[PDB]
Design a protein around this ligand. Structure first.
Ligand SMILES: [Cl-]
Ligand SMILES: [Cl-]
Ligand SMILES: [Cl-]
Ligand SMILES: [Cl-]
Ligand SMILES: [Cl-]
Ligand SMILES: [Cl-]
Ligand SMILES: [Cl-]
Ligand SMILES: [Cl-]
Ligand SMILES: [Cl-]
Ligand SMILES: [Cl-]
Ligand SMILES: [Cl-]
Ligand SMILES: [Cl-]
Ligand SMILES: [Cl-]
Ligand SMILES: [Cl-]
Ligand SMILES: [Cl-]
Ligand SMILES: [Cl-]
Ligand SMILES: [Cl-]
Ligand SMILES: [Cl-]
Ligand SMILES: [Cl-]
Ligand SMILES: [Cl-]
Ligand SMILES: [Cl-]
Ligand SMILES: [K+]
Ligand SMILES: [K+]
Ligand SMILES: [Mg+2]
Ligand SMILES: [Mg+2]
Ligand SMILES: [Mg+2]
Lengths: 230, 202, 204, 239, 244, 220, 234, 248
C-alpha cells in the first residue's frame, strides 16, 4: 500500500536526525557556488566527472526552471531531478493562473514546501539535496538556498557541498555589493578552484547566469574563456 | 465518404475518396482516409473524422506495443479485433465504419469490416461509407474470384469513381494502396486519371 | 434571460492618469424594485476596483470569492496585486465554472500600484478577458451604453471631464432601460485619491 | 536481521525471502517436463501422504488454456493460485486480441506477476516453481519454466523439486529433439522412478500429461492405459 | 561516520549518519550476483552493445537466453543484474516509449527514455516500502542531431550518456580498458566500435570467445533500427580479430 | 472570426482578423487571435473565445514543460496531438477551432483542428465564420512554394475577404510569419477599417452633471 | 522465532510458521469423521460441552441441499467460511439453475483461503473442514486446511486424537463403497469412538450426524435423532 | 509495517506523549521570541537567527508573519514547519471571512490551528509540528490580545510571555517589570529590549540581531508594522542610557 507513518521523528534532544543526515549527504556532495552581483546572478558547480568516457553534455546540474529562473544543487543528483521537475510544474501552474512569470521568491517558497513534506509525510525520507535558485524579477537579482528541512534563505553569496565552510569564508573576503556579473563569474570559478583537485576544464564545471535578459547556462566555449585567467 | 478493400492472392488493395464535409461544405478536398496501423496493416476510415482518427491512433498504440512484446509482426486479425473491441464497447459514443486490411505471414491478404455498431466479419472485398450505397450493384456484378493485384486496383478505382460521381458526400481524388509481403505501394488518381463514364445525354 | 433577472449596468472608462467606474443602484427581481442602494462595485486595492453586473447572487459570490483569493495572494506575495494580474485571477476563477458558470460579467478599473498607469478591462461570464484603451460596459443596457461611450469618450481626459463623460454615458444609457437605474454611483480613481459620487438620477 | 522482508536487500545484494521461497520448492517432490519432436510431456512424482486420499487428489498438473499445460512444485495452494492467474491471463488475452495466447507471452506475463511479489514487505514471494508446455503447428513445441524470483526461460528438458539434479542428468541422456511424445512418456515415467527415493518416501502416484501433434495441440492427461504401460516399463527398467 | 549505522538504516532507504543509503548500495551488489559483464560503445556511425551469453545447462533452449532487448524499433538495450528485475524494467521502458509516441507523435529520444527509467528508480530510493531493482540498463539508439547514443541508468536513479561504458562484474576493468583506448584516439572518439566492445570484454574476462558465448546488438546512422547479430555475423568479427 | 494559414517556400504564414462579438454586437475591435504556443509554433483561434485562450495557453504551458525536459525545440505534431486529444476527450464542448502552424526540425507544418478533435494537415486552411470567404481566395490564388511576400499578400487578402464579407469579422489584419530563421509577429499588419471622425463636440463642462453626494478619500 | 509472527515471512527452511500454527487450531478441535459409499456421504462429529449444563457446540452445518460441512478449529472462522460456501452455492443456482459441483466449491475455498496467507497483516483461516456432498459425479468427502490446501478423500478424520480415527478408517476402507447407509454410519461412529478416552462412550448428547446421498438432501441428526444410529453398535 | 513504525501518536507509561515533549525541546533551543500586551497596542520581539554577513535581506521580516488584516504571529522552532502552519492560519482566517464577512476573532483562529496540532498528537502516525507561536491581534470582542500555542495543541492568552531560548529567565523578568493595566507601547518596547538584552547572553545586543513588530489601532483600522533598524538602534540606545542611571 505505502507506509503511513513518519520516517523522520524527534529525538529526545529535539533533533530531527533524518534531516541532519540528509544535510550530511549534501555536505559530501560536489561543490556549488552562487554569487549575486549588482546586475545578475551566477551559479557554478563542480562536476564529480570521473572518466573521459562521460559525455559531459548529456546531463546538466545547472538547469532552467523558467525563462528567468534557474537552479543548481549539492547532494544527491536523482533527488534533485525530482525537485527540478516539480519546480517547473509549479512555475507553470502559477503562470496559468496569473499570466505573469512566477517571482523567484514564490517559486522558492513552493519548492521549499515540497521539501518540508518529505520530512513528515508517511513512508519517505527527506531529500538529500540543497538547492541554489537564482532569478530576476521586479528589475532585480535574487539568490536563494533551499535545504532538506524545507527552510530557505536569501544570500548575496554562498557555497554548499564539500568544503563549503571554507568556500563561504573565501567569499566573505571577496564579495562586494557593487560587483558586476562578469567579475562575479570569475570569483565564483575561483571559489570552486579553492576545493577543486584535478585541473579545471570547461567540461568538468558548469556555470549558469541570470540577468535582465533571463537565465541560461554558459556554453563550454564561454566557460573556456573565463578559464584562461584561472 | 466511400471506402473499399479487396483481397488477392498475396495481399490486399485498399481505396478511398478524399472528401471531408461539414454539412455540404468541403472542409478537406484531399483527405487521406487510408491510415497505417502497422507496417502492413491499414484501416480505411468513414464516419466521424474525430472518432475514426482517435480510434485509429489508439489501436496503432495498442498494436505497436503488442508487437514489440511478441517480437513478431502482428496479425491482421489482431488489428481488426482491437478495432472491434473499441468500436463495440463505445458503440453508443462513436460514429465509425472501418475496414481493416493488410498482410501477415500467417494468413496472407485479409479484409475485415467493422461497421457501425462494432461487429467484425472477414470478407473477400468490402465497401463502406455514405457512397457505398451507390456501388453495391456494380461490385456485385463486377467482382470475380481470383483477380490479380492490377485487376483489384482497377476494380477499386472504378467502383470508387462511380460512387464519387453520384454521392455528394464523396469526391476529390482516389487514394489507393496495395499491401503484400514486399511492402506497401501507395498512389493517387487525380483529374483525368480517375475512370470516366459519360453522363447519358439524349 | 438569466442575465436580466436582476437587471443592472456597469461601465469603466480610461482618462489621462485616472480611471472611472460606475454602476446603477437598483436591486430588483424582474419588474419589482427591492432596494435602491445595492452595491455592484467593490474595492480590490486602494486603486483597483471591480464592477459586476448580472445575477445579484453571483455578483456577491464572485466579489467574495475573489476577495478570498486576492487576500491570500497579497499575504503570500510581497505586495499589492497588479491590475492585469487581477484580471487573470478573475478569468481563472470564472473559467473553473466553464460548464456551470457564474452569471456575471465584470469590469475592472484601476491604476498600477507602482506606476499608476491606468487599466480597464472586462470579462465574459466564462472568463475571456478583454483589455481596452477607452471603455468597457457590461449589463442589460450594453447597447445603450456603447452608443453613449462611442459618441462621448475622448482620449486623455482630465478627472473632471472623465467624471462628466462617464456620468452622462451611464444616466442616459440606463434611462433607456426598464431594469437598470434607480440611481448611479461613480468612483473616480487617481494616484492620490478616490472620489465617490452618487448622481441625481431618475427614479422610475 | 536481513532476511525478513522481500523489500530488504542483504549487504551482499541478496533477497533472502525469495531464496527461502525457493527452498519450499526444493523440498517438494519432483516434476519434469520434456520437449520433443512433436510436443511436450510432463511427469510428477506425486507423494501420497495418506492412503485415505482418492487417486487424483492434489493434482500437480493443470490445464491453463486449451493448448497450455502447467506442472508445479512447491506449496500447492500458491501453485493453484498461479494456475488461476495463468488462466485469467490466457482468457483476457483471447478476449482482447482474439486468438490463443502464445506460450512465451503467457510465460512472460505470469512471470511478471510472480516477480511483483518479490519487491515488497506487503506481500510474500510464491513458494512454487512451475512449467508451462504447449504445441501448435505454427510455433512448434514449447516448454518454459518459471521460479519464485519470476525468471522465465525456455527448455528442452526441465526438472523442479528435490531430485532436480538427478532428473536432469537422466533427461540429458535422451536425444529428445528426434523423439515423439509417445516414446517420451515412457522415458518420463522411467526417470520419475529412478529419482524417487523408495526408502525415504514410501508411496507415490505417477501423474502424466501431454500436449502435441497427437492431441492436436490440446493439453490433456495421458490416457490411463498409456500411463500404466509407461509405469510398467519404468518399473521393469529399474530391476 | 566511516561506516556508521543507526536504527533501520541498513534495512530500508533512510539516511545513515554519513548520509548514505545502504539499501541502494546493496542493490549495486545485487547487479553482480548474476556473474555477467556487459560493454557498450559508440562511434560516429554506430553504437554497439556486447554481453556474455552463459548457457551452463545443456537442457536450456539457448535461443531464449538473452540479455538484449528491443525497446522500440530504434532503441535497443542490454540488461545486467537480477534477471526478473531486469525484465520488469524492460517492460516499463517499452510502456514509457509507446506512451510517449502516442502522446507526442514522435519517437522517445534515448536520453529521455533513460531519464524516465532513472526517475522511476529514484522513487524506490526514497520510499521505504519497496526495494530498488538490482539491475542496470544500457540503452542505444540514433539521435537525428547528436548521432549514435549510449545511455546508462542504475539502481540509485543516476544516469548518463557515454562514449563507452560497462556494467556488471568487470565494470571497473572495462572502464579502465576503454579510458586507456579513447585517450589514444583523435578527438577522443571510438572508430572500430564492434571490435573495441568485443576486445574489451575478452581482455577483462580473459576468454577469447566462441560466437555462441556473446550477444551483440547494434544501431547505425544508415540503419537506425536495432539489430541483433547472428552467430555467423559474430563469428566474422571474431575471425577478423584473430587474424592480424 | 476569420483565421487562416498557408505553407510557403520557407515557412508558415498565419493570419487573423481582430473582431470579437457578443451576439451581433462588437465587444472588442482589437482582440488578438494568433496565440503563442512555443517560440517556433503559433495557433490562430476561432469559436468560443475563453476556450481558445485557455486551450492554447494550457498546451503552450505543457509544451514548455516538454521542451524544458527534452532540451529541444518542440514539434508541430506534438502540439497537434496534445490539442486534438484534449478536444476529443471533451466531445466538442470545448469550442476551439484552431489553425496551428510552425517550423520544427522536420520543416514547416500546418494543421486545422476542430472542436470535436479532428485534425487535417494541409498546405492551406481557414476557420471561423469568415472561413469560406478566405478559402475562396486561397482556392483561386494559392500556388505551392510561394515567396514570403507573396504568401503574406495572399493571407492578408484572404483575411480581408472574411473582414468585408462576414458580419462576424472585422477591424485589423494580424499576421505571423514563421521560418527556420525568423519569427515576425505583425500585429497589426493592416488596419483597413477606421472609425469616421466626430463632427460635433460634447465636452460637457464641470457642473453639467448634478451630484447628490460626494466623498473624497485621500491615499498615500 | 523472528520467523513466526507474520504469515508473509518465510523461514530459512521454506516454511511459514503462521500457517503451521493455524493448523494447530484444527488439531485441538474435537474430532470429526467423514466417509462415503457408492451412494452416500456421511459426517460424524463429537461435540465438546463447556460445562455439564451446556448443550454441546454445533459441529455440523448445512451449506446447500447437496452439501454439508463438519468443522474443527475457530468456530468464527468456520461460520465465515460456511457463509462464503452458502453464498457460492446460491450464486450458482441463481445463475445456472443447478447445484454447484462439490469439487468446484472446494476449489473456490482454496482460492479464497490462500489469499490472506500471502498478505501482510492478514492471517490464515484457523479452521479445517470435512465437506460431504453429492452431485453428478456421486458422493464426495473433501478436507480443507488453513494452509488453503484441500484433499479429495475416501474418508477422513481431523481434530484431537483423529490419528486413531484415521487408522480405523484405513483398516476398513475397502468395505465402504459397498456399504448400505446404516453400515456406513456405524463405521463413521466406530472410527469416531476410537478418539475417546477408554472410560467414555458415544451418547445422544455428544454425537452429531450429517448425511447426503442420491435419495437424500443434506440432513443433520442431533440428540434423540442419533439414537437409531447408536443402538446396534452390535 | 509494524517493525519500522516509530508510533508517534501513542501514550508512554506515565500518560505522556514523547514526540510532543521532544518537539518542545526543539523549540527551547530556537530563537527567543517574546510578546507584550499594552493599553494602546501589542508587540512581538524576536531574536534573529538569520545573521551571517553574506545573507541578502529580501523580506520585511524573518519570523514575523501577517495572518490577516488584524493579526500577526511569530514562531520559535522548525522554520519549514512554521511556514506550513502560518499558511494554514491565513487560510482559516479567509474561510471565516468568506463565510461571515467579518474578521476571525483572535482566539478562534488560534483554537482552529490548535485543533490541527492536536490531531497530529492523536492519530495519523506522523511527527508533530515543531513550532510554538505567539499571536498578536485586535478584535471587536476583546480588543488587543496576545496568545501562545505549542505542539500539544495547547494555547493560552497572556499579558506578556516568551518562547524559545531562555524562556524561563525572560518570563521571570517580565513577571517583575510588567505593570498590569498600566503598560504603553513605548514602555512595552523598553521592557522587550530590557528582556532580550538579558536573555541573549551570547552576546552584546544589536539591531541586526532583533526584529520587532507592533500592532496598533488608528482611525478604526489595525496597523501592523515591523520597526526599521533606525528605530531599533534608538531603543537599544535608550535602554543603554537608562542603565547608566541605574546606580545614581
Ligand atoms: Cl502504515
Ligand atoms: Cl523536468
Ligand atoms: Cl514562466
Ligand atoms: Cl540553458
Ligand atoms: Cl479524416
Ligand atoms: Cl457502417
Ligand atoms: Cl462502413
Ligand atoms: Cl460516410
Ligand atoms: Cl472533394
Ligand atoms: Cl473560490
Ligand atoms: Cl526446483
Ligand atoms: Cl502510437
Ligand atoms: Cl576505435
Ligand atoms: Cl497527429
Ligand atoms: Cl467563429
Ligand atoms: Cl472444534
Ligand atoms: Cl473458537
Ligand atoms: Cl496442508
Ligand atoms: Cl487434525
Ligand atoms: Cl484579511
Ligand atoms: Cl480578515
Ligand atoms: K461527389
Ligand atoms: K526503498
Ligand atoms: Mg432605467
Ligand atoms: Mg418604474
Ligand atoms: Mg463524439
Amino acid at each position: 500500500r505505502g507506509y503511513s507513518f513518519s520516517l523522520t521523528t524527534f529525538s529526545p534532544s529535539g533533533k530531527l536526525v533524518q534531516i541532519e543526515y540528509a544535510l550530511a549527504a549534501v555536505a559530501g556532495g560536489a561543490p556549488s557556488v552562487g554569487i549575486k552581483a549588482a546586475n545578475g546572478v551566477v551559479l557554478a558547480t563542480e562536476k564529480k566527472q570521473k572518466s573521459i568516457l562521460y559525455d559531459e553534455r548529456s546531463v546538466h546540474k545547472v538547469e532552467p526552471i523558467t525563462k528567468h529562473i534557474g537552479l543548481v544543487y549539492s547532494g544527491m543528483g536523482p533527488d534533485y531531478r525530482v525537485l527540478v521537475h516539480r519546480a517547473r510544474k509549479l512555475a507553470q501552474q502559477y503562470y496559468l493562473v496569473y499570466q505573469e512569470p512566477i517571482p523567484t521568491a514564490q517559486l522558492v517558497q513552493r519548492v521549499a514546501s515540497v521539501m518540508q513534506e518529505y520530512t513528515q509525510s508517511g513512508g519517505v525520507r527527506p531529500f538529500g539535496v540543497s538547492l541554489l535558485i537564482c532569478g530576476w524579477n521586479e528589475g532585480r537579482p535574487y539568490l536563494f538556498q533551499s535545504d532538506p528541512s524545507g527552510a530557505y534563505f536569501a544570500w548575496k553569496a554562498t557555497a554548499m557541498g564539500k568544503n563549503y565552510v571554507n568556500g563561504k569564508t573565501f567569499l566573505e573576503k571577496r564579495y562586494n555589493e557593487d560587483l558586476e556579473l562578469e567579475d562575479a563569474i570569475h570569483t565564483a570559478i575561483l571559489t570552486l578552484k579553492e576545493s577543486f583537485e584535478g585541473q579545471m576544464t570547461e567540461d568538468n564545471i558548469e556555470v549558469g547566469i541570470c540577468n535582465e535578459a533571463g537565465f541560461r547556462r554558459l556554453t563550454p566555449t564561454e566557460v573556456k574563456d573565463y578559464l584562461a585567467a584561472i | 465518404t466511400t471506402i473499399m478493400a479487396v483481397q488477392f492472392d498475396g495481399g490486399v488493395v485498399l481505396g478511398a475518396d478524399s472528401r471531408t464535409t461539414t454539412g455540404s461544405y468541403i472542409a478537406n478536398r484531399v483527405t487521406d482516409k487510408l491510415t497505417p496501423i502497422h507496417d502492413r496493416i491499414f484501416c480505411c476510415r468513414s464516419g466521424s473524422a474525430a472518432d475514426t482518427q482517435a480510434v485509429a491512433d489508439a489501436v496503432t498504440y495498442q498494436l505497436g506495443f503488442h508487437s514489440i512484446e511478441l517480437n513478431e509482426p502482428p496479425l491482421v486479425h489482431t488489428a481488426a479485433s482491437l478495432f472491434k473491441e473499441m468500436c463495440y464497447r463505445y458503440r453508443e459514443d462513436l460514429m465509425a465504419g472501418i475496414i481493416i486490411a493488410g498482410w501477415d505471414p500467417q494468413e496472407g491478404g485479409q479484409v475485415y469490416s467493422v461497421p457501425m455498431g462494432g461487429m467484425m466479419v472477414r470478407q473477400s472485398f468490402a465497401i463502406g461509407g455514405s457512397g457505398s450505397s451507390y456501388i453495391y450493384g456494380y461490385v456485385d456484378a463486377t467482382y470475380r474470384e481470383g483477380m490479380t493485384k492490377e485487376e483489384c486496383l482497377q476494380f477499386t478505382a472504378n467502383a470508387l469513381a462511380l460512387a464519387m460521381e453520384r454521392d455528394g458526400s464523396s469526391g476529390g481524388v482516389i487514394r489507393l494502396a496495395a499491401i503484400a509481403e514486399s511492402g506497401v505501394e501507395r498512389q493517387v488518381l487525380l483529374g483525368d486519371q480517375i475512370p470516366k463514364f459519360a453522363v447519358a445525354t439524349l | 434571460s438569466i442575465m436580466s433577472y436582476n437587471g443592472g449596468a456597469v461601465m469603466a472608462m480610461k482618462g489621462k492618469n485616472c480611471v472611472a467606474i460606475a454602476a446603477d443602484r437598483r436591486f430588483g427581481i424582474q419588474a419589482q424594485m427591492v432596494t435602491t442602494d445595492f452595491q455592484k462595485i467593490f474595492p480590490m486595492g486602494d486603486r483597483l476596483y471591480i464592477g459586476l453586473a448580472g445575477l445579484a447572487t453571483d455578483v456577491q459570490t464572485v466579489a467574495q470569492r475573489l476577495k478570498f483569493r486576492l487576500n491570500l495572494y497579497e499575504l503570500k506575495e510581497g505586495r499589492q496585486i497588479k491590475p492585469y494580474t487581477l484580471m487573470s485571477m478573475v478569468a481563472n476563477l470564472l473559467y473553473e465554472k466553464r460548464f456551470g458558470p457564474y452569471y456575471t460579467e465584470p469590469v475592472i478599473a484601476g491604476l498600477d500600484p507602482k506606476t499608476f498607469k491606468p487599466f480597464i478591462c472586462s470579462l465574459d461570464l466564462i472568463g475571456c478577458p478583454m483589455v481596452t484603451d477607452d471603455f468597457v460596459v457590461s449589463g442589460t443596457c450594453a447597447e445603450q451604453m456603447y452608443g453613449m461611450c462611442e459618441s462621448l469618450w475622448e482620449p486623455n481626459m482630465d478627472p473632471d471631464h472623465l467624471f462628466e463623460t462617464i456620468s452622462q454615458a451611464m444616466l442616459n444609457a440606463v434611462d433607456r432601460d426598464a431594469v437598470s437605474g434607480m440611481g448611479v454611483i461613480v468612483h473616480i480613481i487617481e494616484k492620490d485619491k478616490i472620489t465617490t459620487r452618487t448622481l441625481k438620477a431618475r427614479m422610475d | 536481521g536481513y532476511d525478513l522482508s522481500a523489500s530488504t536487500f542483504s549487504p551482499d545484494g541478496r533477497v533472502f525471502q525469495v531464496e527461502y521461497a525457493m527452498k519450499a520448492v526444493e523440498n517438494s517432490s519432483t516434476a519434469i517436463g520434456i520437449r520433443c519432436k512433436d510436443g511436450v510431456v510432463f511427469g510428477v512424482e506425486k507423494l501420497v501422504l495418506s492412503k485415505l486420499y482418492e487417486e487424483g487428489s492434489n493434482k500437480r498438473l493443470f490445464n491453463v488454456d486449451r493448448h497450455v499445460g502447467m506442472a508445479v512444485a512447491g506449496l500447492l495452494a500458491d501453485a493453484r493460485s498461479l494456475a488461476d492467474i495463468a488462466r485469467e491471463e490466457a482468457s483476457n488475452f483471447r478476449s482482447n486480441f482474439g486468438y490463443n495466447i502464445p506460450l512465451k507471452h503467457l510465460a512472460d506475463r505470469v512471470a511478471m506477476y510472480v516477480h511483483a511479489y518479490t519487491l515488497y514487505s506487503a506481500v510474500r514471494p510464491f513458494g512454487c516453481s512451475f512449467m508451462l508446455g504447449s504445441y501448435s503447428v505454427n510455433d512448434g513445441a514449447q516448454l518454459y519454466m518459471i521460479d519464485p524470483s519470476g525468471v522465465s526461460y525456455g527448455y528442452w528438458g526441465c526438472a523442479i523439486g528435490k531430485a532436480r539434479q538427478a532428473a536432469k542428468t537422466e533427461i540429458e541422456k535422451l536425444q529428445m529433439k528426434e523423439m515423439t511424445c509417445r516414446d517420451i512418456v515412457k522415458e518420463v515415467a522411467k526417470i520419475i522412478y529412478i529419482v524417487h527415493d523408495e526408502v525415504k518416501d514410501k508411496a507415490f502416484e505417477l501423474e502424466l500429461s501431454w500436449v502435441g501433434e497427437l492431441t492436436n495441440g490440446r493439453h490433456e492427461i495421458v490416457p490411463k492405459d498409456i500411463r500404466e504401460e509407461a509405469e510398467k516399463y519404468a518399473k521393469e527398467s529399474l530391476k | 561516520s566511516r561506516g556508521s549505522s543507526a536504527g533501520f538504516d541498513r534495512h530500508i532507504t533512510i539516511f545513515s549518519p554519513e548520509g548514505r543509503l545502504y539499501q541502494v548500495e546493496y542493490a549495486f551488489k545485487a547487479i553482480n550476483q548474476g556473474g555477467l559483464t556487459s560493454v557498450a560503445v559508440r562511434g560516429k556511425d554506430c553504437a554497439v552493445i556486447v554481453t556474455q551469453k552463459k548457457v551452463p545447462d545443456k537442457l536450456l533452449d539457448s535461443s531464449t537466453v538473452t540479455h538484449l532487448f528491443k525497446i522500440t524499433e530504434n532503441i535497443g538495450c542490454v540488461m545486467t543484474g537480477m534477471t526478473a528485475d531486469s525484465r520488469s524494467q524492460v517492460q516499463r521502458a517499452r510502456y514509457e516509449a509507446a506512451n510517449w509516441k502516442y502522446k507526442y507523435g514522435y519517437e522517445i529520444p534515448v536520453d529521455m527514455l533513460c531519464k524516465r527509467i532513472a526517475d522511476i528508480s529514484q522513487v524506490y530510493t526514497q520510499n521505504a516500502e519497496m526495494r530498488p531493482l538490482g539491475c542496470c540498463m544500457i540503452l542505444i539508439g540514433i539521435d537525428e542531431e547528436q548521432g549514435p547514443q549510449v545511455y546508462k541508468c542504475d539502481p540509485a536513479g543516476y544516469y548518463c550518456g557515454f562514449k563507452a561504458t560497462a556494467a556488471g562484474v568487470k565494470q571497473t576493468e572495462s572502464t579502465s580498458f576503454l579510458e586507456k583506448k579513447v585517450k589514444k584516439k583523435f578527438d577522443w572518439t571510438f572508430e572500430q566500435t564492434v571490435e573495441t566492445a568485443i576486445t574489451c570484454l575478452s581482455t577483462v574476462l580473459s576468454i577469447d570467445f566462441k560466437p555462441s558465448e556473446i550477444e551483440v546488438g547494434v544501431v547505425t546512422v544508415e540503419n537506425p533500427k536495432f539489430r541483433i547479430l547472428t552467430e555467423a555475423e559474430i563469428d566474422a568479427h571474431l575471425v577478423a580479430l584473430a587474424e592480424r | 472570426t476569420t483565421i487562416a494559414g498557408v505553407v510557403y517556400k520557407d515557412g508558415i504564414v498565419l493570419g487573423a482578423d481582430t473582431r470579437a462579438t457578443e451576439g451581433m454586437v462588437v465587444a472588442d475591435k482589437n482582440c488578438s487571435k494568433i496565440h503563442f504556443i512555443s517560440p517556433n509554433i503559433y495557433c490562430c483561434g476561432a469559436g468560443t473565445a475563453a476556450d481558445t485562450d485557455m486551450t492554447t495557453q494550457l498546451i503552450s504551458s505543457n509544451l514548455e514543460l516538454h521542451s524544458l525536459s527534452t532540451g529541444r525545440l518542440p514539434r508541430v505534431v506534438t502540439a497537434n496531438r496534445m490539442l486534438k486529444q484534449m478536444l476529443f476527450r471533451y466531445q466538442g464542448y470545448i469550442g476551439a477551432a484552431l489553425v496551428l502552424g510552425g517550423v520544427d526540425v522536420t520543416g514547416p507544418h500546418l494543421y486545422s483542428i476542430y472542436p470535436h478533435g479532428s485534425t487535417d494537415k494541409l498546405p492551406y486552411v481557414t476557420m471561423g465564420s469568415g472561413s469560406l470567404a478566405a478559402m475562396a481566395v486561397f482556392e483561386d490564388k494559392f500556388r505551392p512554394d510561394m515567396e514570403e511576400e507573396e504568401a503574406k499578400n495572399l493571407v492578408s487578402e484572404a483575411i480581408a475577404a472574411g473582414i468585408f464579407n462576414d458580419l462576424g469579422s472585422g477591424s485589423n489584419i494580424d499576421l505571423c510569419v514563421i521560418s527556420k530563421n525568423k519569427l515576425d509577429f505583425l500585429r497589426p499588419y493592416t488596419v483597413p477599417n477606421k472609425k469616421g471622425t466626430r463632427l460635433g463636440r460634447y465636452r460637457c463642462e464641470k457642473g453639467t452633471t448634478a451630484v447628490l453626494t460626494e466623498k473624497i478619500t485621500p491615499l498615500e | 522465532n523472528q520467523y513466526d509472527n507474520d504469515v508473509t515471512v518465510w523461514s530459512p527452511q521454506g516454511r511459514i510458521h503462521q500457517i503451521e500454527y493455524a493448523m494447530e487450531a484444527v488439531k485441538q478441535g474435537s474430532a470429526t469423521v467423514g466417509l462415503k459409499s457408492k451412494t452416500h456421504a456421511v459426517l460424524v462429529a463429537l461435540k465438546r460441552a463447556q460445562s455439564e449444563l451446556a448443550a454441546h457446540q454445533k459441529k455440523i452445518l448445512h451449506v446447500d441441499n447437496h452439501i454439508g460441512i463438519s468443522i474443527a478449529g475457530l468456530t468464527a472462522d468456520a461460520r465465515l467460511l460456511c457463509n462464503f460456501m452458502r453464498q457460492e452455492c446460491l450464486d450458482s443456482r441463481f445463475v445456472f439453475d443447478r447445484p454447484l459441483p462439490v469439487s468446484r466449491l472446494v476449489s473456490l475455498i482454496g482460492s479464497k483461503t490462500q489469499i490472506p496467507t500471502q498478505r501482510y497483516g492478514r492471517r490464515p483461516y484457523g479452521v479445517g473442514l470435512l465437506i460431504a456432498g453429492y452431485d453428478d459425479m456421486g458422493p464426495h468427502i473433501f478436507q480443507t486446511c488453513p494452509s488453503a490446501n484441500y484433499f479429495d478423500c475416501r474418508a477422513m478424520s481431523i481434530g484431537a486424537r483423529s490419528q486413531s480415527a484415521r487408522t480405523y478408517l484405513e483398516r476398513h476402507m475397502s468395505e465402504f463403497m459397498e456399504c448400505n447407509l446404516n453400515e456406513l454410519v456405524k463405521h463413521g461412529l466406530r472410527a469416531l469412538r476410537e478418539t475417546l478416552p477408554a472410560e467414555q462412550d458415544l451418547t445422544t448428547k455428544n454425537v452429531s450426524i450429517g448425511i447426503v446421498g442420491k435419495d437424500l438432501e443434506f440432513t443433520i441428526y442431533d440428540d434423540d435423532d442419533v439414537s437409531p444410529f447408536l443402538e446396534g453398535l452390535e | 509495517s509494524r517493525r519500522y513504525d516509530s508510533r508517534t501518536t501513542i501514550f508512554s507509561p506515565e500518560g505522556r506523549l514523547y514526540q510532543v515533549e521532544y518537539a518542545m525541546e526543539a523549540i527551547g533551543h530556537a530563537g527567543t521570541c517574546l510578546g507584550i500586551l499594552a493599553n494602546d497596542g501589542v508587540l512581538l520581539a524576536a531574536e534573529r537567527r538569520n545573521i551571517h554577513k553574506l545573507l541578502d535581506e529580501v523580506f520585511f521580516s524573518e519570523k514575523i508573519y501577517k495572518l490577516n488584516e488584524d493579526m500577526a504571529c511569530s514562531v520559535a522552532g522548525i522554520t519549514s514547519d512554521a511556514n506550513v502552519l502560518t499558511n494554514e492560519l491565513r487560510l482559516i482566517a479567509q474561510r471565516y471571512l468568506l463565510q461571515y464577512q467579518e474578521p476571525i476573532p483572535c482566539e478562534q483562529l488560534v483554537t482552529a490551528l490548535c485543533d490541527i496540532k492536536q490531531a497530529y498528537t492523536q492519530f495519523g502516525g506522523k511527527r508533530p509540528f515543531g513550532v510554538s507561536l505567539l499571536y498578536i491581534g485586535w478584535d471587536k470582542h476583546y480588543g488587543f490580545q496576545l496568545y501562545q500555542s505549542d505542539p500539544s495543541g495547547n494555547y493560552g492568552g497572556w499579558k506578556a510571555t516568551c518562547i524559545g531560548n531562555n524562556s524561563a529567565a525572560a518570563v521571570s523578568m517580565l513577571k517583575q517589570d510588567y505593570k498590569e493595566g498600566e503598560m504603553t507601547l513605548k514602555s512595552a518596547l523598553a521592557l522587550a529590549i530590557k528582556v532580550l538584552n538579558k536573555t541573549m547572553d551570547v552576546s552584546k545586543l544589536s539591531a541586526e540581531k532583533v526584529e520587532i513588530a507592533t500592532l496598533t489601532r488608528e482611525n478604526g483600522k489595525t496597523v501592523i508594522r515591523v520597526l526599521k533598524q533606525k528605530e531599533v538602534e534608538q531603543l537599544i540606545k535608550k535602554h543603554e542610557e537608562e542603565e547608566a542611571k541605574a546606580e545614581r
